[PDB]
Design a protein around this ligand. Structure first.
Ligand SMILES: *Cc1c(COP(=O)(O)O)cnc(C)c1O
Ligand SMILES: *Cc1c(COP(=O)(O)O)cnc(C)c1O
Lengths: 382, 382
């Protein structure tokens, strides 16, 4: 018999896609749009990393690599996690994946049985519920509030814990809120995992995109319960290279490697060698990170000042490059609001898919010139 | 609760790993071993491919690409499948993946529900039964005989069909046997798919490594029932770039792309542009393929002659770069024969994991000198 499987037919339709279609038809008819939808840095990948790629090519490093990644990179990862994050991990507790997205995918496939529950904090990155459901898991949502700066309340999270809880996903700095969680909150969440016996999944890919505060890794207090996900995508403008990495409990890391061996085999060899350089040449990478950080901060300040002048509400973010704007004064709901802005000449992402109802996500990974234009168009709508 | 999923724990041990452990121990204690274990070309990837990669780097093509692959590549794939395989496909019925292995992985996740049966023809590539069982499928084995040149009998396959049969996997040229199936057998297998309503999965990655006969794609006779898997890995010596592709029913291709968006997002962008060059620059690419076919042919003949003179049995291969050798005159089983050969100074792959019992896989993807050096060491195990 023919026909698709139940797991693939169950995939929910994105609201972001429908808005995006209307954006394309407008472009076709000559309409000038300013896009504030980018989920990746506007800067190109730094030359020290590109150069390392060129060397690998000439050195003929074009053969299959081990499922968990070339050993040199696994060693550099153990160094990065300890030095930058205060995490006590060995090279064997590290893994290279096809982007941080595959680390999360392999992780869920490795720890979830049909029926297992995963607590997610809304607004959340679109992929979390999809991944949990594709592995037969049950999504249990806990909401963070705008009035609380979108920082989780440990008390609201405890109420979502049941005998079936397998994991808790935390993402700080956060996409789409841009919130940075204080160390006290993160320690409180780690404590819940220890007491209730479940995994704490910490998505930290935005660690270097920080404007105020400190990036705390919960793996510092509960290493055997925490699975730290990270990658080179957002920090070094390497989204198209597809290189991510994680660390955590030996048996879980080993399980994730077995999944890669039956699916992707191993990440692109040239990209693994280029990433080793990004981690080893701290001087050149630090220079790129500081340059991007100062640029994003100027862009963020400019945006918030403008939004405030227009009377538009948006919680001030401390990390990443996003801003959740309240659309109440523009329309009754975020989808209708996003369509109105398109007609005004500004492309935004509706908050529907992130569970950020009544809000729209704005990205400041664009030039200041583009941010000023958008603010002008916002004024016209009001 | 903490712990691993059943799907990850269901994966059983490999005989290849166990013998490779002793092989690494001997290499460690100053032992010289000739390796005939390679599953990838010994040639480095051609310069024009490397050159397309450098251009992409210099042009800033390092951003996220669409889930099914960049539009330029999907269009080139349609042409390749039409021109080389006589398949009538559109760019929309085409998909780019992270290696041919991911194409197969996403396929089974998209079409298999727990209990659905898949028919594999033994000896088979180690990954087939792994991917089927991971998706909840049930493996049904149909044996191919050495006396029949490892070519399948449609009648034997027919007897294996039940109401629960979801797919049939065909691999020609074959790994590990090296057999090339005749157009008539492929047509017969395709018709069983249409007659009994199920999917025919055709793994054609070795299509260009053919010494005698013609390559036939069963998709020509059963388009609505056939998923054709291929890739740049073996033909253009690009195993480390991780780029594969497939074509087939529009709705299946669409479901495979959704699995990608939730896991790997999209294959490495630099590698996608490089692959486009390997498909469009026909003159440079054919020159490489022809040069490789010539070399593989010389090595094959050299190997078979040496085996025959030694009094060892082996079915003459028509494609790929493998040879299954009968280990009866050496040891009771293939694992012990593999261990005796190691001590004689030769590393080979036991046939256990491919279900090729009493046989050992030899790879001639190395220099003639190494092949000669290996045959010479074979005298010590008679
Ligand atoms: C970008 C991102 C990731 C991973 O991205 P990759 O491109 O797959 O490395 C994971 N989590 C969040 C919240 C992200 O924004
Ligand atoms: C090498 C191979 C593949 C795919 O390899 P990728 O490196 O993932 O492109 C598929 N089938 C067989 C039989 C192979 O030998």
């Amino acid at each position: 018999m023919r026909g698709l499987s139940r797991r693939v037919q169950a995939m929910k339709p994105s609201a972001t896609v429908a808005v995006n279609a209307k954006a394309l038809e407008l472009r076709r008819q000559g309409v000038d749009l300013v896009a504030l939808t980018a989920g990746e840095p506007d800067f190109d990948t730094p030359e020290h990393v590109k150069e390392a790629a060129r060397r690998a090519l000439a050195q003929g490093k074009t053969k299959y690599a081990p499922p968990a990644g070339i050993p040199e990179l696994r060693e550099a990862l153990a160094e990065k996690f300890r030095r930058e994050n205060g995490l006590s991990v060995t090279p064997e507790e590290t893994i290279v994946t096809v982007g941080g997205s595959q680390a999360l995918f392999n992780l869920f496939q490795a720890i979830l049985d049909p029926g297992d529950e995963v607590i997610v904090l809304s607004p959340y990155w679109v992929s979390y519920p999809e991944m949990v459901r594709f592995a037969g898991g049950v999504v249990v949502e806990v909401e963070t509030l705008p009035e609380e700066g979108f920082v989780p309340d440990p008390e609201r999270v405890r109420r979502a814990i049941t005998p079936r809880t397998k994991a808790l996903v935390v993402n700080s700095p956060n996409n789409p809120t841009g919130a940075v969680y204080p160390k006290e909150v993160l320690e409180a969440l780690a404590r819940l995992a220890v007491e209730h016996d479940f995994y704490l999944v910490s998505d930290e890919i935005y660690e270097h995109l920080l404007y105020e505060g400190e990036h705390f890794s919960p793996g510092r207090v509960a290493p055997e319960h925490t699975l730290t996900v990270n990658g080179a995508a957002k920090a070094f403008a390497m989204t198209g290279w597809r290189i991510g990495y994680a660390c955590g409990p030996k048996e879980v890391i080993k399980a994730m490697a077995s999944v890669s061996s039956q699916s992707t085999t191993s990440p692109d060899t040239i990209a693994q060698w280029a990433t080793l350089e990004a981690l080893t040449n701290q001087e050149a990478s630090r220079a790129f990170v500081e340059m991007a950080r100062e640029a994003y901060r100027r862009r963020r300040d400019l945006l918030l000042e403008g939004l405030t002048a227009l009377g538009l509400k948006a919680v001030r973010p401390s990390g990443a490059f996003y801003v959740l704007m309240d659309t109440s004064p523009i329309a009754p709901d975020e989808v209708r609001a996003a369509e109105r802005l398109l007609e005004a000449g500004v492309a935004v992402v509706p908050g529907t898919d992130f569970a950020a109802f009544g809000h729209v996500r704005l990205s400041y990974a664009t030039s200041e010139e583009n941010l000023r234009k958008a603010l002008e168009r916002f004024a016209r709508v009001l």
